């Protein structure tokens, strides 16, 4: 039962705002896992499970999205320690995060960007269907299962329960945050998510994010540093509309002409990753 004996702990994978994440093996069946540690004194957002156990919001959100299969890294188990929580997460093998993938490969071919973006849209729709807003969609928070061609969302540590009312708090990545957050410290969940997805799609087809500075985020000018089809530019500029009400719904994104004839995950792996 105790964590000590139920998992074999490997080396660090990374640390930051999220916590400290180790490679691990589940002893009962040698399943590859990621073991994430969060210090209680560092957790600002707390929630309750059905039975009213006080847990990090991150555990609440992970449990809501971890039921059945999806493009989200699943919570397999969690433990409370005197000063921390430990989360046992899926670990695809082999894996690379989309940030490192884009650094190494440069601007992705539109066929590959389409497949990746489509899978991120399906994963984000899954979160919203489960009542969860991620609030930190970025290449760093997307893992690629290189053999299956499957993308997995990670790090719900900045997330919230999805609501239809205004958010006045944010702890996600500023360079993916929308102009209404920069200007007014207010945003709505879905329209802010669509803005972050515009930033991500630009990142995929151009090889880096469009904006570094607050003035660029609010300025409303998207300069293409790479060759990008007119249909793809149109979708990006629509996702990055300054007025939230001018942004597409998830339905309008997936019905966009640029998004049609997506590769299956296995086709994506065979053509672009193998």
């Amino acid at each position: 039962e105790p964590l000590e004996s139920q998992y074999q702990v490997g080396p660090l994978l990374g640390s930051g705002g999220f916590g400290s994440v180790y490679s691990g093996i589940r002893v009962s069946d040698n399943l590859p896992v990621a073991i994430k540690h969060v210090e209680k004194d560092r957790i600002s957002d707390w929630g309750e499970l059905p039975n009213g156990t006080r847990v990090p919001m991150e555990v609440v959100l992970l449990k809501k999205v971890s039921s059945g299969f999806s493009g989200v890294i699943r919570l397999l188990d969690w433990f409370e320690r005197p000063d921390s929580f430990v989360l046992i997460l899926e670990r695809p093998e082999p894996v690379q995060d989309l940030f490192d993938f884009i650094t190494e490969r440069g601007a992705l071919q539109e066929e590959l960007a389409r497949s990746f973006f489509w899978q991120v849209l399906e994963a984000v729709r899954h979160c919203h269907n489960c009542g969860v807003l991620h609030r930190d969609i970025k290449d760093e928070n997307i893992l690629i299962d290189l053999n299956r061609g499957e993308l997995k969302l990670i790090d719900f540590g900045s997330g919230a329960l999805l609501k239809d009312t205004v958010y006045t708090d944010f702890d996600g990545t500023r360079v993916y945050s929308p102009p209404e957050w920069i200007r007014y410290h207010r945003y709505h969940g879905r329209s802010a998510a669509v803005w972050s997805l515009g930033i991500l799609l630009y990142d995929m087809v151009c090889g880096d994010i469009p904006f570094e500075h607050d003035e660029e985020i609010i300025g409303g000018q998207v300069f293409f540093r790479q060759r990008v089809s007119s249909e793809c530019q149109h979708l990006i500029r629509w996702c990055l509309a300054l007025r939230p009400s001018d942004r597409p719904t998830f339905e309008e994104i997936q019905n966009h002409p640029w998004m049609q004839d997506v590769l299956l995950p296995q086709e994506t792996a065979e053509i672009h990753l193998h």
């Binding site: 705002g17 884009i102 996600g172 990545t173």
Partner: peptide, 10 residues
């Protein structure tokens, strides 16, 4: 040539 970097949450 141009600097690409990660951006911390917060």
């Amino acid at each position: 040539a141009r600097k690409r970097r990660r951006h911390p949450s917060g």
